[PDB]
Amino acid sequence: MEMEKEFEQIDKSGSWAAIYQDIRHEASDFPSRVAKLPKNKNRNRYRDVSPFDHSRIKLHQEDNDYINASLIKMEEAQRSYILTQGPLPNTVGHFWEMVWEQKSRGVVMLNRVMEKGSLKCAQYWPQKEEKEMIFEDTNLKLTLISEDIKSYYTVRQLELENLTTQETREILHFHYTTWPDFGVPESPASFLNFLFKVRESGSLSPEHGPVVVHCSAGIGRSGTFCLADTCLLLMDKRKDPSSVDIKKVLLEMRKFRMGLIQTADQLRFSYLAVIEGAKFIM
Numbered sequence: 001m002e003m004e005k006e007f008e009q010i011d012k013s014g015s016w017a018a019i020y021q022d023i024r025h026e027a028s029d030f031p032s033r034v035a036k037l038p039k040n041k042n043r044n045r046y047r048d049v050s051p052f053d054h055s056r057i058k059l060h061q062e063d064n065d066y067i068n069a070s071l072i073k074m075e076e077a078q079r080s081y082i083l084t085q086g087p088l089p090n091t092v093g094h095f096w097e098m099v100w101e102q103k104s105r106g107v108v109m110l111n112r113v114m115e116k117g118s119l120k121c122a123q124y125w126p127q128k129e130e131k132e133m134i135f136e137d138t139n140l141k142l143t144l145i146s147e148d149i150k151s152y153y154t155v156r157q158l159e160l161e162n163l164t165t166q167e168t169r170e171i172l173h174f175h176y177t178t179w180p181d182f183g184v185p186e187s188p189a190s191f192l193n194f195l196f197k198v199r200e201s202g203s204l205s206p207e208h209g210p211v212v213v214h215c216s217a218g219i220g221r222s223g224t225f226c227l228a229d230t231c232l233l234l235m236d237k238r239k240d241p242s243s244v245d246i247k248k249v250l251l252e253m254r255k256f257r258m259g260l261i262q263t264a265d266q267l268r269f270s271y272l273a274v275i276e277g278a279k280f281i282m
């Protein structure tokens with residue numbers, strides 16, 4: 001079926017939970033043996049969210065190459081994304097090592113450091129120009145260059161220096177700051193505006209390594225971001241845009257990381273975002 005009328009048909013019939021459970025039943029199951037090794041317990045935030053072995057990002061290290069991060073490679077859309085958990089106190093150096101080694105231009109953050117009165121990720125970037133951060137375990141230096149605070153999101157320019165070679169690179173930090181503590185946003189307008197700002201920066205384009213996108217577990221809000229982006233791109237590429245099947249795209253993405261889209265409300269919100277976005281594109 002088309003999307004917008006499939007949408008109203010699920011609303012009128014109140015069957016979002018059944019649609020979402022079908023997706024959970026059909027989703028791929030691949031091994032995640034490296035994630036479950038005892039030496040990696042303090043590298044995982046949640047015991048039930050792990051990268052598959054076949055698609056995990058490897059650190060360029062011989063001691064321990066493990067990080068909780070996955071490469072989502074979308075062949076028809078010609079887009080790739082790295083989805084990862086919010087960094088932990090003992091993985092902030094690994095996080096920036098990955099950004100460096102994968103040649104990423106942008107980092108997309110979809111959570112606040114504290115939500116619901118609890119810590120959802122480490123404070124992993126510097127808040128003042130004159131107070132830079134040094135990650136001694138991976139030999140990197142990180143400096144805040146500029147910050148632009150808007151009503152729904154903040155953009156930061158950061159300098160990452162490989163202290164071993166003295167090479168430097170400019171990284172863009174795109175921080176969506178207004179996702180509610182509970183539920184999903186009422187309108188997709190600010191999320192779509194944010195997606196378009198990431199696109200306009202070059203951070204999603206083939207001349208750079210894959211964008212790094214995270215929330216707390218790296219599957220829920222993060223899944224919504226890449227699902228909406230890929231669906232909108234396919235609608236621009238194909239002769240028949242009504243042929244784009246958001247459930248089929250989501251199942252394709254779940255071949256590369258488990259659990260993408262965590263609730264039926266997040267599934268409905270993803271439909272809404274793609275539907276509204278397809279009108280603005282034209």
Ligand SMILES: COc1ccc2c(c1)OC[C@@H]1CN3C(=O)CCN3[C@@H]21
Binds near residue numbers: 188189190192280
């Ligand atoms: C309903 O809220 C929105 C907000 C923004 C957009 C949208 C819908 O649909 C796709 C449009 C494409 N466009 C740009 O290129 C910049 C933002 N804007 C997008």
